[PDB]
Design a protein around this nucleic acid. Structure first.
Lengths: 135, 157, 544, 328
DNA sequence: AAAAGGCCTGCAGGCAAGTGCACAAACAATACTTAAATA
DNA sequence: TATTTAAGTATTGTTTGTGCACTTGCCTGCAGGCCTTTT
């Protein structure tokens, strides 16, 4: 019996990525529902969970990152390092081409990870995300 | 011991007393006032940062005698060790060292160093530009080390 | 002048010798372990590639490379009487199905030619192959970097290849170089094709970072390369640990990089490198004697003498009053063996084979060692309770080490290896004085154009007007100094005639502005939103 | 929503603009530039000892490097380190990254002959199947067992260039910089430089960073780029080359459009415009009128909206300038 | 003084002004292939 | 019978095109709130 009841056709991973990468990704997920109309409100220094994600823009990701990174960090070499790591892992891909993305022309970035891995990364990093989604 | 007695306000009048008994000149006095104004918004424990910053400013406002006479270096820490009613020298040297590190990069320090022309550019051009031949501050500079050596020697001998 | 052409080429120490003879030992052990891991990978992949006689023999066997760097070269068996042709496909080589097929066919045909010494670039080449080359064929496909290839195309291609199994004189095998996340792959392909790959797969991993069996091992080898010859403060070790933890894929390469760079800094500024070996005690100079005074160990031990030795006479006589006696007093403690390294290797190999512990890091172990929390380190597994007194090591406070060591207190390496690339720019631009020291008047009374424009830049909102900023900058512009400076050059005729133009202020304002906004686009700060419009722009960077 | 538009700006001829940029950029902060440069020149033996270990030297810091780049490379590094090896000074391969005509294929075709042609590797030249990457792989396998000395020094101006930054070109240069016997030194301007390289490309590059801020005007870089100054003045030369009838009809247009910055309210209606150009006996009908008008239109020399307003978007100042100078 | 008929005003009922812009196809000429002329 | 590459083939790369959109005023539509009386 112990086989007749499951396909077992599969041959949530604790992704190798690191802390700064965890936060990069978990912030780049925040505008799959939070348009720039609200972020400067819910994140200031003072359902589209289902639908396909809207397009980010750079320096917004950096914004929310520097916001929710646990003044502690301003260096951006490892940050962009892991950003390029991500983009090689096709977790936050660009709608535009594959070569000029790394300029600053019209170029949009969007997450390509579903929400379960987001839950995983949040719990593992111990930061909570149920807050920023409100409806 | 006044130093251990933290959680006290040093108002414009009080801080100008703390910087007038030691007679500090106009620019440094007003910078002490303004930096305590700033440091009140960002203090963790007031007395430590206060004594550190004042001693580190006084030790360079009068280098034309400190470097010239090693005894006034002990004289200042003695007259404030009693004014702050401290325990020994050790705690005051902790204070000075740490706070001096905490004020070594603030623009006011560069301005005090450049303005009076007493004696910095050589260190900024080797830290910003990044030479391998700048001093890594694990040692003590030969000038402050000369100060320490000479002062502790004439006090001991 | 000509420079606007495209890439037109132009066709125009004892300390250092110790650097050589030691740095080279370092790199030698590095490259040793490097070739070890490389041969290991080649061996395991060549092994797993064969001997798996799967009686089905109608489905190519698949070899996944978990966490693969995608740079791992592959070798094959020579295996006479049957060509072993490797095929490598890059996500660049894959625009569609047809061109993948053609490029692959051309590659394998050229390889059959090189092994062989008119043909259709298609599947026919397979079955004709025997007739056209004699030996039977066995190809293997190496999709270099799969994650980026459009999986619909790859899927269609695999279904295409499936047809080749009706000739029986060929056999195929697939080598997936997944960057990571096998779940990512099994998320995109058609399940009916997974069920074609799943016939005989092997989740072989290729990761330089796995249980640190290479990480911890190279760390230990480095410890050995630095044994008894220098030291490394807790700050150094914790910094290494931190910067390592944020670089997942290639820790080792970066680890070697930072260690080598620290060594280079030392051997290019530290003057006491010549004093890890007694053969250069005669290499001492009076100025070296002076610089060995300002040591922190020196002052600490002078204070300890004054405290403990109440009679000041011995301390005073052993002081600068003597120089040969003083330098002997110094070299007295030069030979502190620092068992820290010895007991470190001890506990390392111990918990490697006595306790046989793997999922651990010798780096943070050495950190704890220098701290002394090694108990709250080994506790992590609850198996050294019986050994925490035989693997016991209280940290020893060695002396005089403040000359034979390395620590990042000046952040030279950190600032030169891990700079704040945007913060450094914002600082040096807004401040600009710490770097910048007839016409000196304006430089002394008016900032360089870059920074004095950056500062107006700062107060700008998301979308800004070109000309509003132009006027707000005109405010900053001293017309009195602009006429001071333009007519300050009488030697030129045309510039003088320019200097008398009555509306020259706003003209030169627009000139300087259209040079500055010009040079501030390739620098990335401002974006010329909507070229062909350029009526407004956006300030990309913010301070933060 | 009356915004300051760059139209309402004091334009400067290309000659005056160029010449004042010359005066400034060659005299603005000379003494600072030379002091900074003579100070930072002392770092050059530091660069020598750093590149002894092949650490790719990346240069950041505001102001152009191009001048300073060729300065440090061509004059100090190449021939000194060539002499230091124990003879042609090692060919300085300068990459005009600002020049958008650089392509990986041809530059590698150069590189090949620069590098050791010890075997007929041209035999490995094949179809479009890129032998750049495969041949450079082979070249790396070769150099892995070759002696360690710089056999060519390449230097890239503005590594963020419009061509080099193309990810293909970037990866090619990465796999290149893996080679030990070559010294890689370059610089950028894009503040987002670190976005370019993953840990794979960093591992390939082993970048070591250095700030260089000297606050240059980016002379060469100002050349390839272009802004709106680089229209009213466009038509100003057109009208300088026309027929007298066109001159007179545009004269009448400019009077009746400047009578009321030349705004749209100040124009004229084509009904009354035909009435006028027929009264003074210029236009025979509407077809010939619109014909002799489209010669202005077919170069966008006058605006038309709706009344039938033909309004010159050129400024009242520039318009009356046309009147007083080139028309009358 | 409060609870029950009746009538007044705060919330928004709403949508065209309107710009961004993310979709598409040739696009201008890439990069490379394959037959010919000369030793 | 082979090095010349010149022309040609196959392919890249990119250009504006729009197709859709989604925004931000607008007074009116509506409805909770104020007036009145009786015990």
């Amino acid at each position: 019996i112990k086989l007749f009841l499951s396909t077992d056709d599969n041959l949530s991973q604790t992704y190798d990525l690191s802390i700064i990468s965890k936060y990069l990704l978990i912030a780049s997920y925040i505008c799959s529902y939070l348009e720039p109309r609200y972020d400067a409100s819910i994140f200031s220094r003072k359902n589209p969970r289902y639908l396909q994600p809207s397009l980010f823009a750079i320096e917004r990701l950096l914004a929310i990152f520097q916001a929710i990174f646990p003044s502690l960090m301003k260096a951006n070499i490892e940050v962009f390092q892991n950003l390029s790591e991500l983009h090689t892992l096709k977790l936050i891909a660009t709608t535009m081409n594959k070569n000029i993305d790394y300029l600053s022309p019209k170029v949009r970035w969007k997450v390509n990870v579903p929400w379960e891995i987001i839950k995983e990364i949040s719990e593992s990093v111990h930061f909570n995300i149920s807050d920023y989604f409100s409806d | 011991s006044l130093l251990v007695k933290k959680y006290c306000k040093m108002t414009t009048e009080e801080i100008i007393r703390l910087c007038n008994d030691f007679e500090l000149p106009r620019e440094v006095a007003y910078k002490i006032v303004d930096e305590y104004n700033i440091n009140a918004s960002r203090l963790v424990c007031p007395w430590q940062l206060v004594c550190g910053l004042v001693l580190n400013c006084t030790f360079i406002v009068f280098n034309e005698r400190r470097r010239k006479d090693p005894r006034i270096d002990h004289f200042i820490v003695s007259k404030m060790c009693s004014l702050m009613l401290t325990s020994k020298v050790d705690d005051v040297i902790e204070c000075v060292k740490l706070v001096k590190e905490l004020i070594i990069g603030e623009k006011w320090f560069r301005d005090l160093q450049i303005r009076y022309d007493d004696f910095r550019y050589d260190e900024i051009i080797f830290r910003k530009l990044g030479s391998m031949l700048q001093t890594t501050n694990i040692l003590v500079t030969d000038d402050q080390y000369n100060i320490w050596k000479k002062r502790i020697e004439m006090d001991l001998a | 002048a000509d420079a606007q052409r495209s890439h037109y080429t132009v066709y125009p120490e004892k300390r250092w010798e110790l650097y050589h003879q030691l740095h080279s030992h370092f790199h030698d052990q590095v490259d040793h372990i490097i070739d070890n891991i490389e041969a290991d990978l080649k061996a395991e992949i060549s092994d797993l590639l064969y001997s798996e006689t799967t009686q089905k023999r109608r489905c190519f066997n698949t070899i996944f490379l978990l966490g693969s760097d995608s740079t791992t070269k592959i070798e094959l068996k020579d295996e006479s009487s049957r060509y072993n042709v490797l095929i490598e496909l890059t996500p660049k080589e894959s625009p569609n199905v047809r061109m993948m097929l053609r490029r692959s066919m051309y590659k394998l045909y050229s390889a059959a030619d090189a092994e062989e010494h008119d043909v259709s670039y298609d599947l026919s080449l397979v079955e004709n192959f025997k007739r056209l080359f004699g030996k039977d064929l066995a190809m293997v496909f190496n999709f270099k970097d799969v994650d980026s290839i459009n999986f619909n195309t790859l899927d269609n291609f695999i279904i295409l290849l499936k047809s080749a199994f009706k000739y029986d004189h060929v056999k195929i095998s697939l080598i997936f170089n997944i960057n990571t996340n096998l779940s990512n792959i099994e998320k995109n392909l058609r399940q009916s094709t997974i069920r074609l790959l799943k016939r005989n797969y092997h989740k072989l991993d290729v990761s330089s970072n796995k249980g640190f069996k290479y990480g911890n091992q190279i760390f230990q080898s480095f410890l050995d390369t630095v044994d008894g010859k220098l030291n490394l403060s807790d700050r150094f070790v914790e910094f290494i640990l931190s910067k390592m933890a944020n670089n997942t894929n290639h820790n080792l390469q970066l680890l070697t990089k930072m260690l080598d760079y620290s060594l280079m800094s030392y051997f290019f500024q530290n003057a006491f490198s010549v004093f890890i070996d007694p053969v250069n005690v005669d290499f001492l100079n009076d100025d070296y004697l002076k610089i060995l005074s300002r040591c922190p160990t020196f002052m600490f031990f002078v204070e300890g003498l004054i405290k403990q030795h109440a009679p000041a006479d011995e301390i005073l006589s052993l002081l600068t009053n003597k120089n040969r006696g003083l330098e002997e007093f110094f070299v007295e403690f030069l030979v502190r063996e620092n068992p820290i390294n010895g007991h470190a290797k001890f506990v390392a190999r111990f918990l490697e084979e006595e306790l046989n512990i793997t999922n651990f890091n010798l780096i943070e172990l050495y950190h704890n060692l220098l701290i002394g929390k090694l108990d709250s380190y080994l506790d992590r597994w609850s198996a050294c309770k019986e050994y925490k007194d035989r693997l016991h090591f209280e940290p020893i406070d060695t002396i005089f080490q403040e000359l034979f060591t390395l620590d990042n207190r000046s952040g030279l390496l950190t600032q030169s290896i891990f700079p704040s690339y945007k913060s450094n720019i914002e600082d040096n631009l807004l401040s600009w004085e710490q770097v910048l020291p007839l016409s000196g008047d304006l430089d002394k009374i008016m900032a360089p154009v870059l920074g004095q424009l950056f500062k107006l830049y700062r107060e700008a909102n998301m979308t800004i007007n070109i000309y509003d900023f132009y006027i707000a900058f005109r405010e900053t512009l001293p017309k009195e100094e602009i006429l001071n400076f333009i007519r300050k050059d009488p030697s030129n005729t045309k510039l003088l005639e320019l200097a008398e133009t009555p509306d020259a202020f706003d003209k030169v304002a627009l000139i300087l502005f259209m040079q500055a906004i010009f040079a501030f686009e390739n620098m990335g700060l401002i974006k010329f939103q909507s070229t062909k419009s350029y009526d407004l722009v956006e300030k990309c960077v913010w301070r933060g | 929503k009356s915004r300051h538009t760059m139209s309402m700006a004091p334009d400067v001829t290309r000659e005056e603009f160029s010449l004042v940029s010359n005066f400034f950029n060659e005299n603005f902060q000379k003494r600072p530039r030379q002091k900074l440069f003579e100070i930072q020149k002392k770092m050059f033996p530091q660069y020598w000892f750093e590149l002894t270990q092949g650490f790719s030297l990346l240069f950041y810091g505001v102001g152009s490097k191009r001048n300073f780049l060729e300065e440090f490379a061509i004059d100090y590094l190449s021939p000194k380190i060539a002499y230091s090896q124990l003879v042609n000074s090692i060919p300085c391969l300068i990459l005009n990254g600002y020049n958008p005509s650089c392509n990986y294929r041809d530059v590698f075709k150069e590189i090949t002959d620069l590098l050791v042609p010890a075997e007929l590797t041209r035999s490995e030249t094949k179809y479009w199947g890129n032998h750049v990457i495969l041949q450079i792989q082979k070249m790396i396998d070769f150099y892995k067992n070759q002696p360690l000395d710089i056999k060519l020094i390449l230097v890239v101006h503005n590594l963020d260039g419009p061509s080099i930054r193309k990810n293909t070109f970037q990866t090619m240069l990465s796999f290149l910089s893996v080679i030990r016997q070559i010294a890689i030194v370059a610089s950028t301007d894009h503040i987002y430089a670190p976005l370019l390289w993953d840990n794979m490309k960093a591992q390939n590059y082993n970048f070591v960073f250095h700030d260089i801020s000297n606050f240059e005007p980016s002379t060469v870089e100002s050349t390839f780029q272009d802004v709106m100054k680089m229209g009213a003045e466009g038509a100003k030369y057109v009208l300088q080359s026309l027929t007298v009838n066109s001159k007179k009809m545009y004269k009448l247009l400019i009077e009746t459009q400047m009578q009321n910055r030349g705004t749209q309210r100040t124009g004229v209606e084509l009904k009354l415009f035909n009435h006028l150009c027929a009264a003074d006996f210029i236009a025979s009908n509407e077809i010939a009128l619109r014909s002799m008008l489209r010669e202005f239109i077919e170069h966008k020399m006058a605006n038309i909206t709706k009344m039938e307003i033909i309004w010159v978007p050129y400024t009242y100042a520039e318009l009356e300038k046309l009147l007083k100078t080139v028309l009358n």
